[PDB]
Amino acid sequence: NYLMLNKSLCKVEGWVVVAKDNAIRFGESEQIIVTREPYVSCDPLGCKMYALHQGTTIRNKHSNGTIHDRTAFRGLISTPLGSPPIVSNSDFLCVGWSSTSCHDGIGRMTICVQGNNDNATATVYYDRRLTTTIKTWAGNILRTQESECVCHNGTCVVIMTDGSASSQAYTKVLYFHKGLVIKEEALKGSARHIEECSCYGHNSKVTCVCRDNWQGANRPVIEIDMNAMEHTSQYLCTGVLTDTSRPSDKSIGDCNNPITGSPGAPGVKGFGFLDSGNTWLGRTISPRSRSGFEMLKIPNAGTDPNSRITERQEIVDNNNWSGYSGSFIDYWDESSECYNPCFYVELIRGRPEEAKYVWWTSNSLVALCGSPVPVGSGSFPDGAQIQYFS
Amino acid sequence: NYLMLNKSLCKVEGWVVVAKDNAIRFGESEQIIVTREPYVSCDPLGCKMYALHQGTTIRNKHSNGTIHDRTAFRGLISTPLGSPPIVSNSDFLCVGWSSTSCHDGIGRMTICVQGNNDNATATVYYDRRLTTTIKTWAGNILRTQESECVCHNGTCVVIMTDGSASSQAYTKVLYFHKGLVIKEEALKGSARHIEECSCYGHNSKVTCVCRDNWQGANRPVIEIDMNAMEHTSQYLCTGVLTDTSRPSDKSIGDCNNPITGSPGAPGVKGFGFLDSGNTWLGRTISPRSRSGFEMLKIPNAGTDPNSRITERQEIVDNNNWSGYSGSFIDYWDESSECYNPCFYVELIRGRPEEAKYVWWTSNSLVALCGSPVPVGSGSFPDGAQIQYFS
Amino acid sequence: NYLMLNKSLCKVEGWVVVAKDNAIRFGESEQIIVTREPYVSCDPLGCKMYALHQGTTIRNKHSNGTIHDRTAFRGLISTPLGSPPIVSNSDFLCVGWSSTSCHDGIGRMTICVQGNNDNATATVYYDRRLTTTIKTWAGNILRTQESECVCHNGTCVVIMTDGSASSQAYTKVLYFHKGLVIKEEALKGSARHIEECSCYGHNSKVTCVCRDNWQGANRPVIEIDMNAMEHTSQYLCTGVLTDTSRPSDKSIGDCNNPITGSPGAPGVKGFGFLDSGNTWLGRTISPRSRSGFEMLKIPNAGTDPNSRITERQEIVDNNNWSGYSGSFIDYWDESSECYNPCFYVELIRGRPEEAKYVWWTSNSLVALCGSPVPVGSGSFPDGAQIQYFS
Amino acid sequence: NYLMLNKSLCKVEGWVVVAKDNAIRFGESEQIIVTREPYVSCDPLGCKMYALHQGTTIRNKHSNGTIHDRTAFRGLISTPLGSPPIVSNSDFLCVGWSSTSCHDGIGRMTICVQGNNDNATATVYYDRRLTTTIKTWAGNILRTQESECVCHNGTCVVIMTDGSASSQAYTKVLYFHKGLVIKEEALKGSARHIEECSCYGHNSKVTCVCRDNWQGANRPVIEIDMNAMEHTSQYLCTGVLTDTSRPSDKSIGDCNNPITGSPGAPGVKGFGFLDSGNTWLGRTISPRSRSGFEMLKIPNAGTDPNSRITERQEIVDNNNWSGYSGSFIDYWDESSECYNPCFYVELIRGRPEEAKYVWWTSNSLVALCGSPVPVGSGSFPDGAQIQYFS
Ligand SMILES: *[C@@H]1O[C@H](CO)[C@@H](O[C@@H]2O[C@H](CO)[C@@H](O[C@@H]3O[C@H](CO)[C@@H](O)[C@H](O)[C@@H]3O)[C@H](O)[C@H]2NC(C)=O)[C@H](O)[C@H]1NC(C)=O
Ligand SMILES: *[C@@H]1O[C@H](CO)[C@@H](O[C@@H]2O[C@H](CO)[C@@H](O[C@@H]3O[C@H](CO)[C@@H](O)[C@H](O)[C@@H]3O)[C@H](O)[C@H]2NC(C)=O)[C@H](O)[C@H]1NC(C)=O
Ligand SMILES: *[C@@H]1O[C@H](CO)[C@@H](O[C@@H]2O[C@H](CO)[C@@H](O[C@@H]3O[C@H](CO)[C@@H](O)[C@H](O)[C@@H]3O)[C@H](O)[C@H]2NC(C)=O)[C@H](O)[C@H]1NC(C)=O
Ligand SMILES: *[C@@H]1O[C@H](CO)[C@@H](O[C@@H]2O[C@H](CO)[C@@H](O[C@@H]3O[C@H](CO)[C@@H](O)[C@H](O)[C@@H]3O)[C@H](O)[C@H]2NC(C)=O)[C@H](O)[C@H]1NC(C)=O
Ligand SMILES: *[C@@H]1O[C@H](CO)[C@@H](O[C@@H]2O[C@H](CO)[C@@H](O)[C@H](O)[C@H]2NC(C)=O)[C@H](O)[C@H]1NC(C)=O
Ligand SMILES: *[C@@H]1O[C@H](CO)[C@@H](O[C@@H]2O[C@H](CO)[C@@H](O)[C@H](O)[C@H]2NC(C)=O)[C@H](O)[C@H]1NC(C)=O
Ligand SMILES: *[C@@H]1O[C@H](CO)[C@@H](O[C@@H]2O[C@H](CO)[C@@H](O)[C@H](O)[C@H]2NC(C)=O)[C@H](O)[C@H]1NC(C)=O
Ligand SMILES: *[C@@H]1O[C@H](CO)[C@@H](O[C@@H]2O[C@H](CO)[C@@H](O)[C@H](O)[C@H]2NC(C)=O)[C@H](O)[C@H]1NC(C)=O
Ligand SMILES: CCC(CC)O[C@@H]1C=C(C(=O)O)C[C@H](N)[C@H]1NC(C)=O
Ligand SMILES: CCC(CC)O[C@@H]1C=C(C(=O)O)C[C@H](N)[C@H]1NC(C)=O
Ligand SMILES: CCC(CC)O[C@@H]1C=C(C(=O)O)C[C@H](N)[C@H]1NC(C)=O
Ligand SMILES: CCC(CC)O[C@@H]1C=C(C(=O)O)C[C@H](N)[C@H]1NC(C)=O
Ligand SMILES: *[C@@H]1O[C@H](CO)[C@@H](O)[C@H](O)[C@H]1NC(C)=O
Ligand SMILES: *[C@@H]1O[C@H](CO)[C@@H](O)[C@H](O)[C@H]1NC(C)=O
Ligand SMILES: *[C@@H]1O[C@H](CO)[C@@H](O)[C@H](O)[C@H]1NC(C)=O
Ligand SMILES: *[C@@H]1O[C@H](CO)[C@@H](O)[C@H](O)[C@H]1NC(C)=O
Ligand SMILES: [Ca+2]
Ligand SMILES: [Ca+2]
Ligand SMILES: [Ca+2]
Ligand SMILES: [Ca+2]
């Protein structure tokens, strides 16, 4: 029952919300687990939300200090898609402060990276059993995708980075079978820096849209042949810039070099679906802050430096906080002849942005899937009144 | 294993309570989810309560403002029948502020309507996967039944309305197979306005008892042939008026026109079971407010304008709040040769009626099923002391 | 897979605790459901605690007034044996203020009695579906066992009473098949009053030890032939009195008449296992109040008026509150050649006895099973500090 | 499907964290169950945490006094590995204040010891049904392993002790089949006192590393032949002392006699894996207090009195509290040709050590598994700020 990526992407004319956990609203009174960098992964039995918990709930004195990325009290949880995460409905999968997870059609592989900054180790599980460990190779925050990996013919591909966040680093493309590394390649191609890849599968290939945290406000792209287990890397061709922060959009993009100019923030995790005319990119509305979120239809954004926005859908209006965004697909919808693009938006609340109200940072989640036909409109922000928490 | 509606309704001589979640009483301390417009739907594995949550619990500061019908923080939950809804026992099914759900014998179809008032879209799921989307066709609060739909031979019928709440609107009768629209008809017949249909199946047909929010205090009725997938509409014939608000009962009803005179409130969701002599209608006891609830036996209420009440059972006494009511049936009770009529009553607490005590509105649920033999008596109100919440 | 009562009782030399939910201790902070009159019932998949909830938790303002026996907010819950009951782990089975439940080997039958005092109806379920209703026949608190019923060859026997609590009443022995009454007998024999029977099965028979709430401090006994579906009734023969309240033990008991003299309280639910020399009776230690609990070995207590106590085990010491007690047996322990006697003790806290500390009454549960070999000793009281709740 | 111990231990070059429940951090607000002496046990369907609860949660007034070891309100719970224990996710398995549990490949056997200090009885369950009881034989706190037992060919071995904690006592090696004792041996060999054995299986044998609470700061060891069901006992040979408290390490250890000198505390539960060069022992970092935890690689520690530490991994740094530690193995990882050593560390918080902050004592849990390859580093302490609880 190994997943074979034998399908193309569905045409997407618009997006609808399939899940929204409202975690922060509920978190005002219920024991909602403090989380960040969430994502969604499906498998033959359904879909679940995944997130990095902070070993505390919101209305808990330990919520103080949760802006920090890496502690010994972090781990990966999965909770039913659409539900806010509480202890009672959450599966504690592994311990660590960076993660990825995916199902190969028979078993789920999940990875957590734990330990000190200079001496970290990735813990790899298959079917919920420890299978292998991978030591830091650069000695500086070994880290991975923060969204679902993708599998094909029993092999799952994972993108990991080790080394400096703000200059040249050491990224590897890893191929796993049953939670064991069977092949590794150092990053090839023109992408100068790779972080937090959002990946999806199609026709025996995997496309990853990533984060250049070094120089680029245009997103790097990794292309993987899953049968040959080889890859190459590049940048998106559009001058429509979709990282944050970023300068104004250019008339002409650069397929092979990072476009610089970014005001301050070096990056945010994002995604895109590259399918010629059926090409959609995600983007914070603010070019400076993680506020708002919009889906842009940009035909051939992956190949044409003169590509332009043709359609736009607002997901979160610019008066509200967003954050990470990543791709996922139900690869086991056997009643559809195509893979339907889906994505999630992390809705970050608290610090640093709301430091005057609150000592914690957490997030809620909204998840969207594509429709081949025109849809209506609507904004889906976090919805909590932060003052309630002061 | 497709459900075939090959049975008639059981004779009902009286009603007994099968479930009562006591949500508001529990909500005084436990993290009960704030809800409204609930219902019940069965399937081969059992029955569950369905409701529209408000993205908060009662003892949560976000409970303030929950009188509002449509927000981005609303969604559909299912919880085990009889239990009050908390995060731990609730399945978050879709996002939206109007819904319906039913099982076809093999898979469950559920529908949520989400988005802005003028630009709404229905999201349709089959077996918990997004299958189709339906855009607003009138551009004014696309909306549906707020109780279970009904299926036959793999086809499920749904009633939806789009347009003005207080004048002529655009109602469609939709036929689904595996979450895909296979046929649509504009409303036919003499019913002038259709809202919030309560439907049940019998002998390859579906009967819907609805809400005329425009002119009528007598309830419109939709009759559907499930094999031909055609329908017609009408009003109940009785002069015993069962909407709220309503004027006094008339000696002679009108099978083909709305009976006007209503004091204030234009309508409330209700139901009826039309089976000749075995005909029962539901009704708030107050003709002005959503207080009390009574079951009335009115032989041939669906066909005879001179029909009269012959039996009455009080369900909720007039010193207590009620609200919506709708029909449901366990269509998979294979040990019975007949379909037993069941119904639920929404017990609304808080605003607007209890505005001086509280800033929220939510509801509890009581569910009843029929008995072919005389039963005893009893009132089953919400049971919370609203002052405890001040 | 119908249960056939083809086994005898195991020899019991002593008792050990298999479950203790500590509900009141936990109830100091956790949302423990307020309950009373609990019991235990097994089936092929395991054992669960059953209880009558009060539609509230302890640390909830609605806990005020829970001394009252019959409200519209009462129902039957089942929770995993050994766990304290919370909403998250409890199955809300039916609505009512008196109940019984048992598994026939294929399906579980459960019964709740609901409604007004003079107009009550029993609701009967089989495999969690409403099957039949039974109207009050005497018009005064139709009521039943408050512990598990027993089944044989597809037929389950239930004892119900309707009428006066303090004088002659109308008790029926009912035989059910798949939640349908197939036979009823009026009480026969010398027992003058029957309440709250504790029943167990053995060798195609059912023995019930009950409560004479009228005259007798000695317990009435009902003997049922399950193949013939006929019964007879009697009193325990011992002069060792095991109801509460009761006068001092007599040298000579009465097999056929109630022994009077009771100080105040007319009765409490209790049990016994009648197996010649292997005969054990339960008993509050105080002859006046529901405090303490002790198991007494009284050979031939069921047949010999000169029977004497030979062994004694203290379960709850006399400095602590007890309450109801009843019998249960795992009839699906296929690895044992005998049915092992088990019983539960209801540990009542709050009113009326602790009225000066608290406005609620609830209970915790301790459950014991027999051992064919000598065991050690120990007291297992509720364990809550009632002052914590003031 | 009986487990056959047909495998050897995997080589371990280092340890990674697979689970950390963060119970005390969560316990600041969520209803976390108060526990101590936890452990981990696997079976064909996965792994779960086991612990002795105290019949209360942390933020509960009944948490006051939980330093006491033995009450009637103690029992054994199992909760999903990695999750903190709450009522909603915990299985209440038996009642008592000492326990062990293991799966034989077909059914789980679990044991609780309950009752008074001089008159205790072990309750034994197989497949969650009471199977046998074992009365105290020395009349002084009958007690057992506080970690998982081990099974082979349908037989599970358990180590129990009865008698004085601070002098000669009466230890038995018990062999169970389906929860029935089939063989018992009095302790043989040179070990003078045996408490709280940590056991693991390998090649049809079981090795237990225990606690000499009488004289020895070096750990006693029990060797069991599982086919012959015979055992012998000894001490670890190393002069590297791994009990607490303990004097400084000696150059030469004693294979056959306890090494004395211990400052104060007579012992703590610990473990070791004895596999020649692949030999690892656990140890509190402080030789006086239960603070810190370190894994030491000591080749042939079980056979060579001149054995030395060669590798060391810090698990919990010496600024943090630890406690018990024990061994466990997933014996049903069929994709590995070897049994991978795993262990847990109990992280005790509260009294006696933090008596000035708090009136309770509880623990959190961290669980580690081996890796055949070098890993990174990191400390994994409890992580709660005890001042938050004052
Ligand atoms: C959340 O955690 C932060 C950090 O612990 C808390 O802020 C800190 O509060 C302490 C007082 O409890 C401040 O300590 C002070 O430090 C100065 C030196 O900077 C010293 O001279 C004083 O005697 C005092 O000890 C500390 O400065 C302050 N830190 C910051 C960054 O403001 C905060 O109060 C916590 N929030 C809640 C709601 O508890
Ligand atoms: C539940 O929500 C309502 C609405 O937010 C709260 O009522 C509102 O309370 C605010 C004060 O916090 C009032 O604001 C005032 O508005 C007037 C103008 O109308 C302005 O001149 C004042 O300076 C002040 O800002 C607001 O009027 C009031 N709204 C209503 C409709 O009464 C309510 O307090 C909330 N309940 C709880 C328990 O928090
Ligand atoms: C639990 O519920 C009981 C019953 O409602 C509460 O006791 C009652 O408290 C009210 C005051 O809130 C008393 O009302 C008084 O009644 C007298 C006539 O008897 C009237 O003249 C006074 O003006 C006043 O309204 C009532 O007597 C009293 N009932 C009893 C039996 O004492 C009790 O306070 C509740 N407990 C908690 C903790 O809220
Ligand atoms: C946790 O439990 C302990 C033990 O019950 C509490 O400490 C105790 O507090 C009581 C007062 O409530 C003290 O009682 C006093 O005893 C002396 C004789 O020793 C007597 O002369 C006084 O009249 C008074 O009754 C008791 O000494 C004290 N025990 C200890 C060991 O300090 C403690 O307060 C509880 N913690 C919390 C937060 O409630
Ligand atoms: C899917 O994976 C299998 C296993 O790796 C591939 O089949 C193997 O192909 C190699 C040669 O390329 C043979 O030596 C092995 O014996 C094959 N294994 C089996 C089990 O048949 C297969 O080629 C892969 N599919 C694709 C499309 O590449
Ligand atoms: C139940 O549904 C099936 C499928 O729609 C109906 O069977 C189809 O009937 C049409 C003609 O009306 C044929 O062309 C199809 O080939 C049939 N499909 C199958 C799978 O047999 C069937 O008629 C419906 N039942 C009723 C009573 O109307
Ligand atoms: C167990 O129950 C079955 C069903 O009631 C009994 O079998 C029936 O016996 C009657 C005569 O007594 C026959 O007329 C029926 O045809 C039988 N039914 C079946 C399905 O065989 C059976 O006798 C009962 N067992 C005992 C020991 O009394
Ligand atoms: C595993 O256990 C079984 C059962 O105890 C052992 O098989 C038994 O061996 C005895 C003689 O030693 C025979 O008398 C029994 O008839 C056997 N029972 C069965 C079911 O075959 C078996 O020897 C054990 N395995 C090992 C390796 O010792
Ligand atoms: C360490 C570099 C990495 C990518 C730039 O930083 C990320 C920045 C993130 C951010 O920009 O919000 C927060 C992430 N938690 C962090 N990842 C880790 C493992 O700490
Ligand atoms: C928008 C018209 C519609 C039917 C009249 O209003 C209903 C009135 C209801 C009512 O009268 O209580 C509340 C319902 N939540 C609402 N439905 C929606 C989708 O908002
Ligand atoms: C109504 C008579 C009946 C038996 C004497 O009273 C019982 C007394 C019980 C008791 O003595 O504690 C409380 C029970 N809840 C009650 N049963 C019902 C249905 O109310
Ligand atoms: C009774 C002797 C026994 C072993 C020394 O004491 C243990 C000491 C333990 C300890 O040193 O922390 C606490 C354990 N809870 C206790 N075991 C029991 C059953 O009480
Ligand atoms: C409805 O939403 C779509 C975006 O999906 C937008 O193009 C369209 O203009 C909207 N219609 C109205 C009336 O706002
Ligand atoms: C019992 O209830 C029925 C209604 O179901 C009613 O007709 C009857 O009069 C009631 N009996 C009494 C005595 O109240
Ligand atoms: C142990 O308990 C039994 C009761 O089960 C009792 O007979 C015996 O005397 C007790 N032993 C001691 C030493 O208390
Ligand atoms: C990483 O951890 C190992 C222990 O597992 C240790 O031997 C090594 O020195 C560490 N490396 C660094 C750079 O700290
Ligand atoms: Ca960037
Ligand atoms: Ca109307
Ligand atoms: Ca009596
Ligand atoms: Ca020692």
TrEMBL record, chains A, B, C, D:
Gene name, please? NA
Q: Which UniProt keyword terms apply here?
A: Calcium, Disulfide bond, Glycoprotein, Glycosidase, Host cell membrane, Host membrane, Hydrolase, Membrane, Metal-binding, Signal-anchor, Transmembrane, Transmembrane helix, Virion
Positions of disulphide bridges: C10-C338, C42-C47, C94-C112, C102-C149, C151-C156, C197-C210, C199-C208, C237-C255, C342-C369
Record note on modification: N-glycosylated.
The UniProt entry annotates the active site at D69, Y324
| Record's subunit section | Homotetramer.
Q: What is this protein called?
A: Neuraminidase
How the protein sits in the membrane? Single-pass type II membrane protein
Residues holding Ca(2+): D212, G216, D243, P266
- Grouped into one coarse class, the protein's main location is host cell
List the molecular function annotations (GO) for this entry: exo-alpha-sialidase activity; metal ion binding
